[PDB]
């Protein structure tokens, strides 16, 4: 049964609630972004409206094969009417096509649903700046003060240098990057770009990227592996046994892989900086973990919420245990008491 934190009061709207069957009363199903926890349940056999970004639309049409009529894409940053309710989609700074949704209720209540987001100061000068938000449905993935990580730009800086160093030291080395969903495309695109290459990948991954409205994408990616010295592999595959395997397949064209595993937070964030990172090494295969996050750090989230001063906050992540719920409320109270809302 669809939980109360996927439902928008005073509408027939639900958010990311595609895995329960028909939800009684639901006229419209919003999808914040194309990640499988959020879309779980969609298929070619959905015959209710889906509202989503253009980019999310493309992924629904081409990867899940939903029929063009049931996908309603909306532009961003545009006041739009949806069954006589004003809504706005805003960039979530998560993965490609990811949105937050502003709901303007008939009664005068205004609700923000973040989806998955990485909060940023640029959102404080968006349409959000213009009016009071009473309710906040919040991505709480990293709602705990241990959760720090560097900026995306810091990480991209690191990766670019590492890659360029080695390739200039040994020109028969291969860069590999792990991946399992959309998100984090800048890792492999920045590397490829410093190396004078396209990125090579499987046909299914190429198809996924061709939906994302990346500009000049045809000049950045290919399905021809042999021609490319930045490759993408399934994240499962980024280990010694699976890389060794892959080092064979290229057929004596490279003598060293330098792989990057973009990860979320890991406990080595608690003791080690980004400039002081190392990889695991079994012979000629070195695997970097690099903490490129597409979710708010604790401090980023804290700041966004303290600027927003919502009358009420409803968590969408880590809501499955009473301990997490109780812990999170404690942080929301401190924030509100510090900030005087
Ligand atoms: Ni996500």
Provide the CB-side half-sphere exposure for 289 (13 A, CA): 13
Gap between the Cα atoms of 290 and 274, Å rounded: 8
Q: In terms of Cα–Cα distance, which of 125, 100, 128, 134 is closest to 316?
A: 100
Which residue pairs, CB below 8 angstroms and at least 24 apart, start in 271-278? Answer: 273/150, 274/150, 274/154, 274/155, 274/158, 275/158, 277/158
Q: Measured at the alpha carbon of residue 205, what is the angle toward residues 210 and 216, in degrees to the nearest 5?
A: 30
Beta strands in 182-254 (DSSP E): 199-200, 221-222, 230-234
Spatial contact of 64 and 78, defined as CB atoms under 8 Å apart: no
Q: Which domains does the chain show, CATH number per domain?
A: 1-147+296-341 (3.60.15.10), 148-295 (3.40.50.12650)
Pairing of strands 173-179, 230-234: parallel
CA distance 109 to 96: 29
Task: With beta carbons less than 8 A apart as the criterion, state whether 286 and 276 touch.
Answer: no
What sign does the dihedral 130-135-141-142 (CA atoms) show? Answer: positive
Which residues partner with 290 through β-bridges? 262
How far, in Å, from the CA of 131 to the mean position of ligand 1? 27
CB-based contacts of 183: which residues, under 8 Å, 6+ apart? Answer: 35, 94, 95, 96, 294
The half-sphere exposure of 49 on its side-chain side, counting CA atoms within 13 A, is: 15
Which conformational region is residue 288 in: left (phi greater than 0), alpha (psi within -120 to 50 degrees), or beta? beta
Element holding 71 (H helix, E strand): strand 71-74
Q: From ligand 1's centre to the CA of 245, what distance in Å?
A: 30
Q: Tell me how the structure was determined.
A: X-ray
Please choose, from the candidates 232, 171, 205, the residue with its C-alpha nearest in 3D space to the C-alpha of residue 62: 205
241: number of Cβ within 10 Å:
10
CA 63 / ligand 1 centre spacing (Å): 17
Q: Which is nearest to 176 in space by CA: 144, 199, 207? A: 199
Contacts of 162 (CB under 8 A, 6+ apart): 258, 260, 288
Are the C-beta atoms of residues 118 and 296 closer than 8 Å to each other?
yes
CA–centroid distance, 98 to ligand 1, in Å, is 8
Q: In angstroms, what is the span from residue 116 Cα to ligand 1's centroid?
A: 5
Q: Is 121 helix (H, G, I), strand (E, B) or coil?
A: helix
Query: Resolution limit in angstroms?
Result: 1.8
Distance 252 CA to ligand 1 centre (A): 38
Distance (Å, whole) CA 220 – CA 194? 12
Ligand 1 mean position, distance from CA 235 (Å)? 16
Report the C-alpha gap between 149 and 266 in whole angstroms.
10
Strand partners, 312: 135
Phi/psi class of residue 85: alpha, beta or left (left: φ > 0; alpha: ψ in -120 to 50)?
beta
Distance CA 237, CA 212 (A): 24
Comparing CA positions, the residue from 112, 157, 110, 119 lying closest to residue 141 is 119
């Amino acid at each position: 049964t669809c939980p109360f934190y996927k439902k928008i009061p005073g509408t027939g709207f639900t958010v990311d609630a595609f895995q329960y069957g028909v939800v009684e009363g639901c006229t419209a199903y919003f999808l914040t972004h194309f990640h499988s926890d959020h879309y779980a349940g969609l298929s070619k056999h959905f015959t209710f409206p889906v509202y989503c970004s253009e980019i999310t639309g493309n992924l629904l049409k081409n990867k899940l094969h939903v029929q063009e009529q049931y996908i309603h894409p909306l532009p961003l940053d545009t006041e739009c009417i949806v069954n006589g309710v004003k809504v706005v989609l805003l960039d979530a700074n998560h993965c490609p096509g990811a949105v937050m949704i502003l709901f303007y209720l008939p009664n005068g209540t205004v609700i923000l649903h973040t989806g998955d987001f990485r909060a940023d100061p640029s959102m404080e000068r968006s349409l959000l700046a213009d009016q009071k938000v009473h309710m906040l449905y919040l991505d709480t993935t990293y709602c705990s003060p241990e959760y720090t990580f560097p900026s995306q730009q810091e990480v991209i800086r690191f990766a670019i240098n590492t890659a360029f160093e080695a390739v200039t030291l040994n020109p028969h080395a291969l860069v590999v990057c792990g991946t399992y969903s959309i998100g984090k495309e800048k890792v492999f695109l920045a590397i490829a770009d410093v190396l004078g290459s396209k990125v090579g990948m499987s046909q299914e991954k190429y198809k996924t990227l061709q939906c994302l409205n990346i500009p000049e994408i045809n000049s950045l990616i290919t399905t021809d592996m042999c021609s490319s010295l930045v490759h993408l592999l399934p994240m499962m595959q980024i280990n010694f046994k699976g890389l060794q395997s892959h080092l064979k397949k290229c057929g004596g064209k490279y003598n060293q892989i330098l792989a990057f595993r973009p990860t979320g937070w890991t406990h080595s964030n608690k003791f080690t900086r980004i400039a002081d990172v190392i990889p695991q090494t079994k012979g000629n295969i070195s695997i970097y973990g690099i903490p490129y996050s597409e979710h708010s750090s604790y401090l980023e989230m804290k700041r966004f919420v303290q600027w927003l001063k919502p009358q009420k906050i409803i968590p969408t992540v880590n809501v499955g245990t009473w301990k997490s719920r109780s812990t999170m409320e404690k942080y929301f109270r401190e924030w509100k008491l510090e900030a005087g809302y």
